[PDB]
Structure 1
Amino acid sequence: VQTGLKAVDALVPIGRGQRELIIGDRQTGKTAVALDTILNQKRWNNGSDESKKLYCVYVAVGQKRSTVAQLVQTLEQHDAMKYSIIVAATASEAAPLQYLAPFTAASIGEWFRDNGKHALIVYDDLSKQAVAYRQLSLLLRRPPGREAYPGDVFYLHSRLLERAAKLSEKEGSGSLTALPVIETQGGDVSAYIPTNVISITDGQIFLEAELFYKGIRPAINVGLSVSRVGSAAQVKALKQVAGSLKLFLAQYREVAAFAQFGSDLDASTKQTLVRGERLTQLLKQNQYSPLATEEQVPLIYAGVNGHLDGIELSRIGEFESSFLSYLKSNHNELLTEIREKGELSKELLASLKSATESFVAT
């Protein structure tokens, strides 16, 4: 399920059928990740191959109405509304409708899965559904659980999220994929509900405010984000050049923590620091701009095989588009193979190798 988000599609690759949590504090970019994913499907939905298509269902739970508005506008500004279904249980509606929406929605997109197609359900967001489900119960007078929630607030979510699955051939191969959202407080993931859902899903993407304000956007936390399906759902080409990146990026935080001692570095640590800094920077991405795989691939390859390592950090911005501009212009025949084939054959690694070096010498 290609999101077109460099950080996500190389680090936490999401699969048709899997449930994947988006969790972080308020105002961190949770909705933004979900949105940028939807926008991307244009690539396939304006085609005619029904089995490459991904229909989106966006569930608004406890959002204010104008905010659902502001959002359908953007979907339309991107001709993205023709393949979506928003289901809204806004702030003002009855607690029962809020609690219900995700279930009703799950069914709307279950139609797609049952019928040979693939939907994508975004639950934005479960923290509120539980707030409301708490409200029915306390008022129905059922005795409360922890933080006044009902006893089976877990069962609540578990049964919804299990409804996402990737059917077998006998059953039509339809998938339903879930991106629930969850809002924490003060970064605490050890609070009731997040804990519940965290263990229900096939991995999480943690967004962080600290990361954000120092310029990593998506403010994904590689350290903590996982996709438990893993490489099974990555594109072969992306997989090939992303070999070890996520582990490496960890080692990078490692050496950068030891850097705080401000004691002299050797040629090994300075080496991985230079690359990690550039890799970090290479994954930064503007909102509303999902990238094709073949745009992603050469970027990642340039970073990983260290062709970026002798280039100013402020300039990596300009590298990205200037690179892509040139690759489209000249070696378009590669870009179109990567796309068509999804797998870098040995000669294609060659052409790409040549192609990158070429350009780095301006």
Structure 2
Amino acid sequence: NLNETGRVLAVGDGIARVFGLNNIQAEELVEFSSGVKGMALNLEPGQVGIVLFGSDRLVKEGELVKRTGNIVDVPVGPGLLGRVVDALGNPIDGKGPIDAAGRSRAQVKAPGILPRRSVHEPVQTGLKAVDALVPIGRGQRELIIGDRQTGKTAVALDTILNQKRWNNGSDESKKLYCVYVAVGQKRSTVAQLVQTLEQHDAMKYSIIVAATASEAAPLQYLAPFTAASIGEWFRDNGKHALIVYDDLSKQAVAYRQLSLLLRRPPGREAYPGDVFYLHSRLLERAAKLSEKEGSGSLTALPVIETQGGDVSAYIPTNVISITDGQIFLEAELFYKGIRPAINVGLSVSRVGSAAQVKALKQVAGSLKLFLAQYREVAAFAQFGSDLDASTKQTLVRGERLTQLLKQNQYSPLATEEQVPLIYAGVNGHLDGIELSRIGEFESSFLSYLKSNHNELLTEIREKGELSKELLASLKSATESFVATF
């Protein structure tokens, strides 16, 4: 035929150049005699360059190839929940065929300027150092940047687990479906990551798009977009979906590989000029739809791995420029004990209070202050008692306020349990307590309220605010426990 078919002229490096297909579309899929499929990214006057989704051992010279007449598409809908699929959208867990409610193109245009709303729905991560300091909002793009082995996944992972508080409820505009995008991670890791969510009953509302490192590059290229659509479904239909790209760094590497092999112009660090257009066209897909559009929303938590704190690198600079805040993590802070090691100094959020519970905002507005002055007078802590009383007071707080943020992994706390801890910290009811007993303080204090002041906690959970009556009732209950302690 020559118009719907083509002959392999040359194959290699997981990229084969075919001749023919004079009617093939851009980025369209194709199928080889062997069975392995690919998509043509380069459309030259003579030949057509096509990447492979499988080993190039299957593809030979002169082999026949036929069109598919379809662009990269993936099946979306609520059937995926509790499953584990690859970039294409096939099952890999062995639970049977998937039940999708339709398909969506890998490449979807972001919502326009008009069909959006200022983020206003908080995304409780269950992390004290986060929901208090860097609040995240439904539709926001908060970036989890940090060196290797710092606690980047911990942040997201806990977030998902902290969703059992609403997903097992009845109201929908309150739930939050989680979509994790494994890119460049070995299978062993995914199999474990999945096994953790199950032991916590989180797979009930989580979607895993696995893209192991052994898989072809393009797979690791389409993974983020594939998963992107899946979540947009929820967004379009008027719901809430949280998607975590872990990690975009690996994605760029994959894409760089394809681009170089295809002999496209190499830029800074061997990345083609369209690398930024890649992530910008991905993150902008998540947002907050207006009331007319469905009030639906898609949150994005992209993960970037820096090389020795170098946030000045190419890739990171691109991502950091697009997102709407970072949760910078440092290994050093990790070693001291501060876990999760979230550098309050750098970690920021452009949305801020706009997406934070007023119950916590009333006690967090000041918490950023003390910590701020603490980092400035942190050198004094190393000197003798010759420090004046003024500065010394700061050290007393900081040591304790920093000790409170330390939260064990897999142990998210609801807002009703955060406020009481922050309120006692800010006022300074812990200053008298030893800096060694701060840990057990949280335990015994929470258990106290849930037996004597349970009525207060439940009023904060429902109202979400703190009236002058509660502020006084909470203070009295605290001073009482601190006294008996």
> What TM-score does the superposition give when structure 2 sets the normalisation length?
0.74
Match of residue 279, structure 2, among 157, 162, 165: 157
Alpha-carbon distance, 1:260 to partner: 4.1
- Residue 74 (str. 1) matches residue 196 (str. 2): yes
- Indicate the structure (1 or 2) with the bigger Cα radius of gyration: 2
Alpha-carbon distance, 1:143 to partner: 1.3
Q: Which residue in 2 is equivalent to 1:272?
A: 394
1:84 & 1:22 partners in 2: Cα distance?
A: 19
SS of the residue corresponding to residue 26 of structure 1 reads coil
Question: Which contiguous aligned blocks of 4+ residues in structure 1 show a shift greater than 2 angstroms?
Answer: 257-263
Q: Which residue in 2 is equivalent to 1:60?
A: 182
2:314 & 2:432 partners in 1: Cα distance?
A: 47
Alpha-carbon distance, 1:248 to partner: 2.1
Q: Deviations over 1:88-137 (max 9, x none)?
A: 11111110010110001110000000011000000000000000000110
2:428 & 2:189 partners in 1: Cα distance?
A: 43
SS of the residue corresponding to residue 268 of structure 1 reads helix
SS of the residue corresponding to residue 48 of structure 1 reads coil
1:206 & 1:271 partners in 2: Cα distance?
A: 28
Alpha-carbon distance, 1:21 to partner: 0.2
Comparing 76-85 and 259-268, the one that deviates more: 259-268
1:255 & 1:80 partners in 2: Cα distance?
A: 42
Alpha-carbon distance, 1:261 to partner: 5.3
2:465 & 2:476 partners in 1: Cα distance?
A: 18
Instruction: Name stretches of at least 5 consecutive residues in structure 2 with no aligned partner.
Output: 1-122
SS of the residue corresponding to residue 47 of structure 1 reads coil
Q: Deviations over 1:188-224 (max 9, x none)?
A: 1111111110111110001100000000001000000
2:425 & 2:385 partners in 1: Cα distance?
A: 27
Alpha-carbon distance, 1:257 to partner: 2.5
2:209 & 2:128 partners in 1: Cα distance?
A: 28
**Contact 2:370 2:397 (8 Å CA) reproduced:** no
Q: Which residue in 2 is equivalent to 1:41?
A: 163
Comparing 247-256 and 23-32, the one that deviates more: 247-256
SS of the residue corresponding to residue 187 of structure 1 reads coil
SS of the residue corresponding to residue 165 of structure 2 reads helix
Q: Which residue in 2 is equivalent to 1:10?
A: 132
2:304 & 2:142 partners in 1: Cα distance?
A: 11
Q: Which residue in 2 is equivalent to 1:203?
A: 325
Comparing 152-161 and 261-270, the one that deviates more: 261-270
**Contact 2:380 2:387 (8 Å CA) reproduced:** no
- Please give the root-mean-square deviation of Cα atoms over the aligned residues, in Å: 0.9
Q: Which residue in 1 is equivalent to 2:463?
A: 341
1:289 & 1:283 partners in 2: Cα distance?
A: 12
1:272 & 1:320 partners in 2: Cα distance?
A: 21
Comparing 8-17 and 264-273, the one that deviates more: 264-273
SS of the residue corresponding to residue 57 of structure 1 reads strand
2:203 & 2:336 partners in 1: Cα distance?
A: 33
Q: Deviations over 1:312-353 (max 9, x none)?
A: 111000100100000001000000000011000110001101
Return the structure number with greater strand share.
2
- Residue 92 (str. 1) matches residue 217 (str. 2): no
Q: Deviations over 1:156-196 (max 9, x none)?
A: 10110000100000000000000000001111111111111
2:303 & 2:207 partners in 1: Cα distance?
A: 17
**Contact 2:139 2:286 (8 Å CA) reproduced:** yes
2:382 & 2:414 partners in 1: Cα distance?
A: 37
Alpha-carbon distance, 1:59 to partner: 0.1
**Contact 2:366 2:426 (8 Å CA) reproduced:** no
SS of the residue corresponding to residue 238 of structure 1 reads helix
1:257 & 1:236 partners in 2: Cα distance?
A: 34
SS of the residue corresponding to residue 242 of structure 2 reads strand
Alpha-carbon distance, 1:247 to partner: 2.8
- Residue 281 (str. 1) matches residue 403 (str. 2): yes
Q: Mapping of 1:172-211 within 5 angstroms?
A: 172-211=294-333
1:126 & 1:247 partners in 2: Cα distance?
A: 33
Relative contact order higher in (CA < 8 Å, ≥ 6 apart):
1
Match of residue 293, structure 1, among 415, 420, 432: 415
2:237 & 2:468 partners in 1: Cα distance?
A: 39
1:294 & 1:54 partners in 2: Cα distance?
A: 19
2:351 & 2:335 partners in 1: Cα distance?
A: 30
- Residue 139 (str. 1) matches residue 261 (str. 2): yes
Match of residue 442, structure 2, among 314, 320, 329: 320
> What TM-score does the superposition give when structure 1 sets the normalisation length?
0.99
2:236 & 2:224 partners in 1: Cα distance?
A: 18
Q: Deviations over 1:216-257 (max 9, x none)?
A: 001000000001100011100100011221132121010112
Q: Deviations over 1:263-316 (max 9, x none)?
A: 721111111110011000011000000001010000000000110111111100
Return the structure number with greater helix share.
1
1:46 & 1:257 partners in 2: Cα distance?
A: 48
**Contact 2:242 2:300 (8 Å CA) reproduced:** yes
**Contact 2:181 2:246 (8 Å CA) reproduced:** yes
1:324 & 1:251 partners in 2: Cα distance?
A: 29
1:61 & 1:289 partners in 2: Cα distance?
A: 26
Alpha-carbon distance, 1:30 to partner: 0.5
Instruction: Name stretches of at least 5 consecutive residues in structure 1 with no aligned partner.
Output: none
SS of the residue corresponding to residue 287 of structure 1 reads coil
2:270 & 2:249 partners in 1: Cα distance?
A: 14
SS of the residue corresponding to residue 18 of structure 1 reads coil
Comparing 258-267 and 271-280, the one that deviates more: 258-267
